[PDB]
């Protein structure tokens, strides 16, 4: 395999309304329903999906039920009314996974050989995009365990469609179009500096988890390696960027030229009609 | 205030100081000093 | 004034604010604050264009440009020649000619010859560093011309009688930051040189906060000007 996904918010509301279907009744654990999908390339798409009744008792996390007859009858309806659509996986509303999810996944990989799950949150405040993709494949193990069948975080994104926001941006009414030039950059400053480096501080919290704990899979495979991709910049004290300040002066050069010349011409913009219309409105007032 | 007696009774203003040296001196400047190479 | 300086909230009639900045800039003439005086006396010069055809703008320019001659360098003054000025010989055409020449005999012939009109100057502190402005105009012209110059050339070509007197003038020139000269005090070498990095790497992009601070000031003066009707 999967490149990434294309997921419209329509199917997310198709999770939300069934969360309304279960929020009125006894919610045991969470929602598990079908994720239909439009798989064409190694990229993915989802235009629609549906749900299915489900309970689970947490004693061996193996007593859990869908209705495959209901799944294939309503899938026969939706396949009948739309030949484009097919199943691509499932979803769950509780944002943390558990051990049964490989039995859900591998139990429904019999219909199509991939069955991607979707993490969402019905009350999201801290995540970025809600949508999430795994794939249940193996890297065996370095020790080669008996089939360490593993979910893999395939990258994920919100999909888009022409004329799908006809509802949406009319509904929300709150959008300030083109806040370039005012405070959007510092919204992204607070949220990327703070909300980026706090994630860095939870990764260094996981480093302390390797200090006092974390011997499970101490993970000396990807961590220092892509952290050496990070360590393309060893930015230690004395800072060692003598070969970057004439670079910085080259970067500052043209832009401060544009501010000098161009903003002098911005003065040349305001002054003419400001004076002429000024004294028109001044000495032509009486 | 202003009068009290007086109602009864890139240009040259840029150049006139060097043009003074173009007014009294060095008329045939490198044409006698230009002639120093062969007259002397 | 200096303990209780209070100037206008808003400027008055431009004749009054013009002549007012001429008065206080004419105080900074004798106070010898040469930086502010050239721009407030330039401002005051250009800001009063209306005058009687026999003068008072040549009075304002005449008694304006004396310390501008005393800056060590001057441009060739204004830009609009006046013949009744030429009859009155007010701001000394011949003396500023003696300034841009490195001359001393005709210079002090202007000084000694016209002293009844130097009474009409009333600012005899002009000459006491204006002969010094002749010699600094000479060393500034020659030093500005040559890449390297030596005391064997200038110290007796300008007849300063000795190496060390020119080393004192270049001591005051490096003290004034005029020249990037050096002097080997062993054989008598002014081992003078010219510094480098005239490119627009850093200095104009630093200057653009003065250029654009100026521009935003005129933006806001245009806005406050718009606030009136």
| Site of tokens 């005449």 | C62
- At A34, give phi and psi (nearest 5°): -75, 140
Cβ neighbours around A263 below 10 Å, total: 17
Residue in the block written with tokens 């544009």? A258
For residue A174, CA distances in Å to A61, A169, A170, A177, B30 come to 44, 8, 9, 9, 81
> Is residue A122 within 8 Å of residue A19, measured between CB atoms?
yes
Q: Does C202 sit within 8 Å of A249, measured CB to CB?
A: yes
Token pair in block for residue A118: 């979707």
The kind and range of the H/E element at C158 are none
Q: At what angle do helices C203-226 and A245-283 cross, to 10 degrees?
A: 20
**CA angle C66-C68-C70, nearest 5°?**
75
State whether B13 and C96 contact (CB < 8 Å): no
| Residue in C96, C97, C72, C102 with CA at minimum distance from that of residue C173 | C72
State the Cα–Cα distance between residues C139 and C143, nearest whole angstrom. 5
Runs of H (alpha helix) within A41-126: 68-81, 101-108
Pick B12's closest partner by Cβ from C81, C96, C97: C81
Q: How big is the B-C interface in CB pairs under 8 Å? A: 32
* Pairing of β A32-39 and β A86-92: antiparallel
> How close does chain C come to B17, measured CA to CA in Å?
6
Out of C55, C80, C97, the one facing B13 most closely (by C-beta) is C80
- Cα distance between residue A49 and residue A39, in whole Å: 13
The torsion angle over the Cα atoms of residues C202, C206, C207 and C213, rounded to 10 degrees, is 160
Dihedral through CA C13, CA C18, CA C21, CA C26, nearest 10? -140
Smallest CA–CA distance from B10 into chain C, residue: C79
Domain borders along chain A are 2-182, 223-282
Measure CB to CB from residue C211 to each of A260, A271, A278 and give the nearest one.
A260
Whether the Cβ atoms of residue C205 and residue A253 lie closer than 8 Å to each other: yes
Q: Which of A101, A160, A162 is nearest to A135 (CA)?
A: A101
Experimental method of this PDB entry: cryo-EM
Name, in order, each residue with C-beta under 8 angstroms of C50's C-beta and a sequence gap of 6 or more.
C15
Six-digit token pair at C177?
Answer: 């930051």
Structure tokens at A132: 């999430």
Sequence-ordered list of residues with C-beta below 8 angstroms from that of C43, at least 6 positions apart, any chain: C18, C21
Distance from CA of C53 to the nearest CA of A (A): 30
C8 touches chain A (CB under 8 A): no
Q: Min CA distance, C76 vs chain A (Å)?
A: 29
Closest CA to A135 of A150, A148, A157: A150
SS3 A38: strand
Instruction: For residues A211 and A217, give the distance between their C-alpha atoms in angstroms, rounded to a whole number.
Output: 13
The answer to whether residue C186 neighbours chain B at the CB level (below 8 Å) is no
Residues 6+ apart with CB under 8 A from A4: A43, A44, A133, A154, A155, A156, A157
DSSP string, A97-114: --TTHHHHHHHHTTTSS-
Q: The tokens of C97 are what?
A: 């000619």
Whether residue C96 and residue B17 make contact (CB cut-off 8 A), yes or no, is: yes
| CB neighbour list of residue C162: distance below 8 Å, 6 or more residues apart | C155
- Helix, strand or coil for residue C9? coil
| Nearest alpha-carbon partner for C37 in C62, C16, C67 | C67
Residues 10-39 of B with CB under 8 A from C: 10-18, 20
**CB–CB of A30/A82 below 8 Å?**
no
Q: What are phi and psi of A36, to 5 degrees?
A: -70, 165
The β-bridge partners of A39 are A44
Q: How far apart are CA A274 and CA C151, in angstroms?
A: 59
Tell if the CB–CB gap between C76 and B9 is shorter than 8 Å: no
b vs e for C87-103, b when ≥16 Cβ sit within 10 Å of the residue's Cβ?
Answer: ebebbbeebbbbbbbbe
Half-sphere exposure of C214 (CA within 13 A, CB side): 9
């Amino acid at each position: 395999a999967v490149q990434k996904v294309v997921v419209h918010p329509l199917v997310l509301l198709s999770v939300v309304d069934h969360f309304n279907r279960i929020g009125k009744v006894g919610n045991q654990k969470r929602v598990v329903g079908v994720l239909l999908g439009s798989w064409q390339k190694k990229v993915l798409d989802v235009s629609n999906s549906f749900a299915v009744p489900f309970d689970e008792d947490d004693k061996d996390d193996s007593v859990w039920f869908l209705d495959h007859d209901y799944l294939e009858n309503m899938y026969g309806m939706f396949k009948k009314v739309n030949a484009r659509e097919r199943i691509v996986g499932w979803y769950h509303t509780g944002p943390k996974l558990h051990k049964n999810d490989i039995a859900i996944n591998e139990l429904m990989k019999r219909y199509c050989p991939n069955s991607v799950l979707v993490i969402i949150d019905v009350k999201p405040k801290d995540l970025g995009l809600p949508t999430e993709a795994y794939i249940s494949v193996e890297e065996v193990h370095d020790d080669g365990t008996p089939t360490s069948k593993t979910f893999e975080h395939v990258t994920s994104e919100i999909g888009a469609e022409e004329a799908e926001e006809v509802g949406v941006e009319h509904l929300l009414r709150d959008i300030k179009d083109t806040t370039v030039g005012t405070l959007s950059q510092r919204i992204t400053n607070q949220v990327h500096g703070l909300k980026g480096l706090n994630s860095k501080l939870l990764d260094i919290r996981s480093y302390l988890e390797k200090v006092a704990t974390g011997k499970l899979p101490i993970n000396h495979q990807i961590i220092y390696q892509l952290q050496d991709v990070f360590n393309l910049l060893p930015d230690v004290s004395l800072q060692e960027f003598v070969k970057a300040f004439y670079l910085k002066t080259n970067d500052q050069m043209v832009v401060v030229y544009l501010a000098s010349l161009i903003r002098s011409v911005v003065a040349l913009h305001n002054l003419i009609n400001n004076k002429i219309a000024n004294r028109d409105a001044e000495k032509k007032e009486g | 205030m202003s009068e009290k007696k007086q109602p009864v009774d890139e240009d040259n203003w840029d150049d006139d100081n060097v043009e003074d040296d173009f007014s009294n001196q060095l008329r045939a400047e490198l044409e006698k000093h230009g002639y120093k190479m062969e007259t002397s | 004034k200096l303990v209780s300086k209070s100037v206008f909230p808003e400027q008055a009639n431009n004749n009054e604010w013009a002549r007012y900045l001429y008065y206080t800039g004419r105080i900074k003439a004798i106070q010898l604050e040469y930086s502010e005086a050239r721009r407030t006396m330039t401002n005051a010069l250009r800001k009063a264009p209306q005058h009687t055809a026999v003068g008072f703008k040549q009075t304002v320019h005449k008694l304006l440009i004396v310390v501008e001659l005393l800056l060590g360098e001057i441009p060739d003054r204004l830009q609009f020649r006046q013949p009744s000025l030429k009859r009155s010989l007010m701001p000394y055409f011949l003396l500023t000619q003696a300034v841009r020449t490195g001359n001393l005999a005709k210079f002090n012939q202007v000084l000694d010859q016209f002293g009844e009109k130097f009474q009409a100057d009333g600012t005899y502190t002009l000459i006491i560093r204006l002969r010094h402005n002749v010699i600094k105009t000479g060393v500034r012209m020659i030093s500005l011309s040559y890449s390297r110059i030596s005391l064997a050339d200038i110290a007796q070509k300008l007849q300063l009688d000795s190496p060390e007197d020119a080393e004192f003038i270049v001591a005051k020139a490096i003290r004034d930051g005029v020249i990037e000269a050096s002097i080997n005090h062993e054989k008598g070498y002014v081992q003078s040189k010219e510094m480098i990095d005239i490119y627009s790497t850093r200095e104009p992009q630093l200057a653009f906060h003065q250029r654009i601070s100026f521009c935003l000031d005129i933006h806001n003066m245009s806005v406050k000007a718009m606030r009136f009707p």
